[PDB]
Amino acid sequence: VREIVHIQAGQCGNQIGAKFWEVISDEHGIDPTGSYHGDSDLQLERINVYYNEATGGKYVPRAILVDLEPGTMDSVRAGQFGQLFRPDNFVFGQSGAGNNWAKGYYTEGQELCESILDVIRKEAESCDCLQGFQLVHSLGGGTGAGLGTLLLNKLREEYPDRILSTYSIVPSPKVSDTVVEPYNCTLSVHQLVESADEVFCIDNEALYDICFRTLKLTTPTYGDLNHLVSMVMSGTTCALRFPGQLNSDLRKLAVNLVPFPRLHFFIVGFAPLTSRGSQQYRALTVPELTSQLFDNKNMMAACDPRRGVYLTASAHFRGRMSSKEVDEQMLNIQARNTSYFVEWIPSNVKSAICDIPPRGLKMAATFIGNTTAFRELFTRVDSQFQKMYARRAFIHWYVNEGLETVEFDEARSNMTDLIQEYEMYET
Amino acid sequence: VREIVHIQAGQCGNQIGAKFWEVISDEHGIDPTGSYHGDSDLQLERINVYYNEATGGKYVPRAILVDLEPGTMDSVRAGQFGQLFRPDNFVFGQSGAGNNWAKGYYTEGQELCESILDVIRKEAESCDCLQGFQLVHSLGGGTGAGLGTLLLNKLREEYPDRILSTYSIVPSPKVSDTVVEPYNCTLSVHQLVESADEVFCIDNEALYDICFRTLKLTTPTYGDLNHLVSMVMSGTTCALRFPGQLNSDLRKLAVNLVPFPRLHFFIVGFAPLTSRGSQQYRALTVPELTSQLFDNKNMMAACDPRRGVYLTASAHFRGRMSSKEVDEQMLNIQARNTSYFVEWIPSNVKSAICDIPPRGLKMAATFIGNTTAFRELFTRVDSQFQKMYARRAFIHWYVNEGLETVEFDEARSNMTDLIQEYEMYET
Amino acid sequence: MELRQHSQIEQIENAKIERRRREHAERLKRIMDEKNLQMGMDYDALQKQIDEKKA
Amino acid sequence: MREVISIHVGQAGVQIGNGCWELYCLEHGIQPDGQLPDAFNTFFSETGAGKHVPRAVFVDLEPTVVDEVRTGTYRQLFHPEQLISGKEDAANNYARGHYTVGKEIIDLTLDRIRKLADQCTGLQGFLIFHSFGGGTGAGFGSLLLERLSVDYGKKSKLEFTVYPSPQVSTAIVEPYNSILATHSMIDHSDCAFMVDNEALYDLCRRALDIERPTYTNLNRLIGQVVSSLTASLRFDGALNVDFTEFQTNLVPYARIHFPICSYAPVISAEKAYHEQLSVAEITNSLFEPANMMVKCDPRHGKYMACTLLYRGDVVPKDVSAAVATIKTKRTIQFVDWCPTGFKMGINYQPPTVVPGGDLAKVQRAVCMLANTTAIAEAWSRLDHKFDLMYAKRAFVHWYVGEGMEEAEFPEAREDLALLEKDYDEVAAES
Amino acid sequence: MREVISIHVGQAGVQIGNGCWELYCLEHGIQPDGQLPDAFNTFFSETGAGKHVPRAVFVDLEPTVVDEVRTGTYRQLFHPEQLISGKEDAANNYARGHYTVGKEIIDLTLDRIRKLADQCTGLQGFLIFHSFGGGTGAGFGSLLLERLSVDYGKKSKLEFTVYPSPQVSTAIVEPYNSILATHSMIDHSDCAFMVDNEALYDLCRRALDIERPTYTNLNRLIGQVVSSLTASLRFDGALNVDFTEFQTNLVPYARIHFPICSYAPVISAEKAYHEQLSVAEITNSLFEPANMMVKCDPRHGKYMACTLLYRGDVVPKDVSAAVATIKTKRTIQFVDWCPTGFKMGINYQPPTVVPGGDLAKVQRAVCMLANTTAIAEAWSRLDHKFDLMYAKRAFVHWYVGEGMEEAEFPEAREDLALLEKDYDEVAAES
């Protein structure tokens, strides 16, 4: 009884979130019509974490979907599992997104803000207990980036104690789908640092790299990319839903990995990812997972850990496995790569074991780590933003909405200070 | 044995009452021909409250129909349940309504009033006991607004002890169907404040908003709006007709809800309402009814409770349910939202339970509240009256009936004093 | 204006939902055939144009 | 039950009336002979057996126009006492049709209308048709009204008069007659509607695609409004408007009673195949200067209270949406007082057409009668025409010779001046 | 639902439009009568029964071009009100089309466009077509745009106009009209696309295999571009781009809005059978100077943000691979302050071929609009031709006689000069 409320914003959030419920529904065993047709009693133990039950044996997810234009919504209901969601949690506007952060924050955000909060209030106050919320959005756009940050303040004001876990997609370095991304990403960062507890950062380029290097997919689509992200979201909350030999929920993760309030940005990775031809050669052992997780290529964010130093690391294991073997690997990897860890924190690796694995896989692992390599990703957007801002640019589109030019300077100042903060703690 | 006399005056009142008898007759199981064909012995326990029995098993309602022109009387005569009423109870004039308050109150009202009062007298004196009266009328018209006040003063003169509960519809804030309503409503307010014990205000606009938002009805005719309002009349007096764990009649409600002699205007609501096809997504329980009742959108009057504060509130519950569940819910909603309730009145929420819910629902609820938010509505009509009165304008049509200009100033003076009295008690 | 709209509209949206699932499925088939994706052409109906230009 | 009396005077009034009774009799299902092959009683009396007789009186001081009806198809419909004809017309002279010739037949006429009012138990108004330029339309129209005021007092008297057009004119002495009749209408009439031929002519070319209309096509357009106006007394509906409700809503004062009219949709058959004609479009087309039946521009002034009358499958819900949409038009000016500004009527019987007609058969239609200050523009035109003639005494000898005293000519100018003052006084800032 | 309105001004506007509406009706599957043998709402309305009607208004000051539609096969599709024809054209005179003859018809047109916008619940923009050298295209287009700006305010007014060719010319007074219209469009138009006949003429000979084209072949090319741009609103896709997204991403400042056009593949049927036309191939073909629809080479200038539209079975991976390769090409320049520089869209619905058409039925295609400083080359050429004629005052008497004040000739010259200064300062880098 540690319920979690799920919020999806924008095109990125709705498609990632829709694929997310396909994963969980099959894990728990819920038919797409919403009825339980499962195979084990353990599934119905703690389905209350994510679902409400409609009288009749029909289970409804705790999902709230937000967008400024209804185009993406009807694409979700056209999906196989779209009938599952409650029709009244569909909250959408009747205006173009604009791909504009200021337009989403000031003009269309305020109109939708009041309606969304009450929809949040229904699901937040319908359960016996509430641990935290779960936000899925991208930062390069205007809808999820703009309105997502505004809702993040209101959630913090009303519900300070609860865990505001957010998952973010960062604009890519090489090829990106929007010109004005440096403006959108820089402004959004100010709200994430002060409001949310936990932030996980995903880069689209690394998702492509994993597909071509490891999975050997000849033609990857956005379905395959979004499938990888859903696994990490599934893994983190698995400790809530199933029994295990060593439990670790969200609040344990925040306490251990976060040493200071502002340093809470994370990278993730998932093992085992097996090539379709290498399956016959790979013998699944616990050390085999350890190799994939700490390998730099497996990281879902295009920031190389070797260029920085680790502060904390966390690994989650799923399946029945030896406790000695898991604990020995954390010692082994820590002691054999000592140059990448900070001296003034001993035992930088946290570990956990959960008993029930994903379907088809007899053992799997999840990795969450915090490192100084993030200075790379923020320096990237800062450089592009400066040149786009030294001369004025598309900026007039934002000024005509109500945003003041001083907000950009404040946006860069806070973003710059977080870069220096990670510089200091490397020493 | 707590009989109640029902009077229908004007177009709006007549059609609401016509639907209102369909609700009762189905709930008791009386054939449209006036004969009993029901299914439970409990229906015949206390049918005497609303009906008279004609020798032969034919049941006749205690209804009196009033209008100034015969148009609506013929409309009811052709209705499905038209034959139910007693033909001698149809009293009407032979002149146009005129949409004039002064004309209805002074010119045509006096000749009709002496006959109407005697029509009341046969039914009021025919029964073993008589607790109160029931009137349905509008407050923007010429017949209901004017003649309803005239009969209310006379009924108070003859029956001082009885509860003169009336049901009124207020002119809408955005779009309304008459040019000269502000004159009509202002003049009627003087009478209702001093003579009627209980007044329930309902707005047509909130009825439409409930229709789209919850009922999804694309084209709501006047049948749906009157049926929704008919639910509230049926809910309030249900405690007299059926047994329950905690009885609460009209006088119990007056003493509880009304703290001072002049603050007795009420806002009403009902739950649950069925979203087409979406009812399969909803698990109806006692906590779910509580969510709708204190949801501000389900209020039938277009005055926002959140902009004011509450003084007293009352909820009825119908069906076999837990008494602990009811009493815990009232406490929960009062403790979680302390800002909207007054300190110098503790336990602002009254509760009650009835055993037999209406047909079609295994449980249902009724909400009645009294709040300072009525100041929004009375400011509306006072403002339109003020800028119309300064120019004089349409007064030309009321003066030629015998109404002095001094009555307009007196009517505003009492109306404004009522607004101030709500202002002062907010402290 | 006047209609039972929601009872009609539900059928309209249900038909649209089924419509998109069909074109999603048949698109998926012709995508997975990577010759048609990277390289393919409609070589039959394209030829019909050439004889028209001869005519 | 409830009854309305229709009186037709002069050539213009009776020629419109022939078209009106065709429209009514066809709508109720009565053959032109008065037999059948409800609302019937609002316009007709049932003689017995199965025969019906209208409530109408036809009067003109010359027999040509009335004899057309006496010889035409409708000869079997009327009661011959109703068809009243003089000997020689007024020669487009006010003084002749009021003082010298008009008095031969006034007392005969007043007996017939009063005799017709006895059979009518629940009367609520009159319907009178005029043309201002004519001697019989104005001179005899003024004389008839003056008596009906004292004869009946507090019964609403509603008029339908053709105001002289800006440029189109068929009589040279037309401005003289209009001002003399202007005094009589303002005091006695309860409410008088304005129409003019020039706007009707332009209306029946653009909307109805007619190359070259006649007086016949115009008369069917006017009859639709009267049928639309009185449909609330005849048919069922969600919202009913009586004559008195009309009277209180439209007029804020005593001398400001003159409205102007509009109708929608007026469309041809082959255009109706392209257009939806839902309640939004029909209400939006009402407010265009193109559709107004008086060639005066509403944007030159402001609006007082307006009344809308709907005919068809119209639900109370989106008529509110239509009115809300109209209030957003910044090209539409409303006066600060009377912020409500509307009364709406919904009745369910669709419009009726006529064989060989001009109007397409439509799901629903809307009729608009509104009160605006733009009609002072119509008075200013007529005033300027009068002053040029009377400066040099262009035609006074004809009117003086027929009994008229000259002192009336400046007095009638004085009264029209006061009326122009009253409208600008009300139209001024609050 | 979401709506776009098209207005077609002048001979060029009408001739382009009837080709465009042929493309759309065949694309959606509507017979010329409007019947059927979805996204219909974006361009059409449902009249009832089963008949549709376009959202278009055709305007010209002479009847010959419009009457061709009235007697053509498509006469049944259009509402007769939509086709507006004047009495006598502007004779390639801007003053005649702006002051004298233009104001005779302006208010008739503005009613019909406004009335059509009532039917558009979710209106998001207009499309307007011109030919700059024509009197009505330049003169009446300026008056239409200026009025439309204040009437509707913040609504996207997108234009699709034909630039005078650098050497091909059919009017001697052609430079005079273009510069005068340049002032009116710069402040009122939200974004205006540029094409010229000479570049199109060269394209339909080389890429498409036609020895001797006509205006029909060029206009069918333009319809493909409009079809691809609007396809994001109509049909499903993996990456949608609304009108507002185009407006924000392309233009860095209010004054620099002019894009240029490109489309690929444009290939004949037999050569289309010869090759295979992958995503990388079509993206490469967009950036060659030969494919540009305006006869100005981008290599003299630099690129600001460019927008890509992909139609067919194109997968988001193959797009990213192609655009990155283009960034590596050192024959393509980008100003330093646009490192991102791109906006991409993917849509699933292939283009539609036409009976008697010229282009191949390919299964994957791309459309391109880019903002470049090379367009300043076109501005300089028009400026030089104008100076030679105006120095000796070669044609002033015609414009002055038709109401134009002479002082407007130097003002329009300076406004164009100011526009050329803005591009040079933007082209610089720091």
Ligand SMILES: Nc1nc2c(ncn2[C@@H]2O[C@H](COP(=O)(O)OP(=O)(O)OP(=O)(O)O)[C@@H](O)[C@H]2O)c(=O)[nH]1
């Ligand atoms: N709308 C309409 N107007 C008509 C018709 N017939 C005549 N008129 C108008 O009547 C106006 C003049 O009134 P008169 O024709 O003189 O009619 P009158 O009142 O009988 O005057 P006298 O014939 O001289 O006695 C002209 O301006 C016409 O426009 C008609 O059939 N329809």
Ligand SMILES: Nc1nc2c(ncn2[C@@H]2O[C@H](COP(=O)(O)OP(=O)(O)OP(=O)(O)O)[C@@H](O)[C@H]2O)c(=O)[nH]1
């Ligand atoms: N691309 C293209 N251009 C055209 C076409 N027809 C005319 N033009 C161009 O239009 C210009 C001549 O002006 P018009 O087409 O007559 O435009 P207009 O506004 O109607 O000018 P007026 O006839 O004086 O009213 C020439 O420069 C042509 O190049 C066409 O079908 N396609």
Ligand SMILES: Nc1nc2c(ncn2[C@@H]2O[C@H](COP(=O)(O)OP(=O)(O)O)[C@@H](O)[C@H]2O)c(=O)[nH]1
């Ligand atoms: N990983 C991933 N990225 C996506 C998906 N769909 C869109 N994107 C990317 O997300 C970025 C921002 O999307 P956008 O439409 O602006 O989202 P919004 O503005 O918040 O509604 C774009 O560059 C897209 O390419 C998806 O399904 N998965």
Ligand SMILES: Nc1nc2c(ncn2[C@@H]2O[C@H](COP(=O)(O)OP(=O)(O)O)[C@@H](O)[C@H]2O)c(=O)[nH]1
């Ligand atoms: N709820 C409801 N309201 C109505 C109905 N009919 C009319 N009204 C409203 O009642 C208001 C005044 O009614 P009115 O006709 O003046 O009643 P009267 O006083 O008897 O003449 C109008 O604004 C109508 O909108 C109905 O059937 N139901």
Ligand SMILES: [Mg+2]
């Ligand atoms: Mg005559």
Ligand SMILES: [Mg+2]
């Ligand atoms: Mg032309």
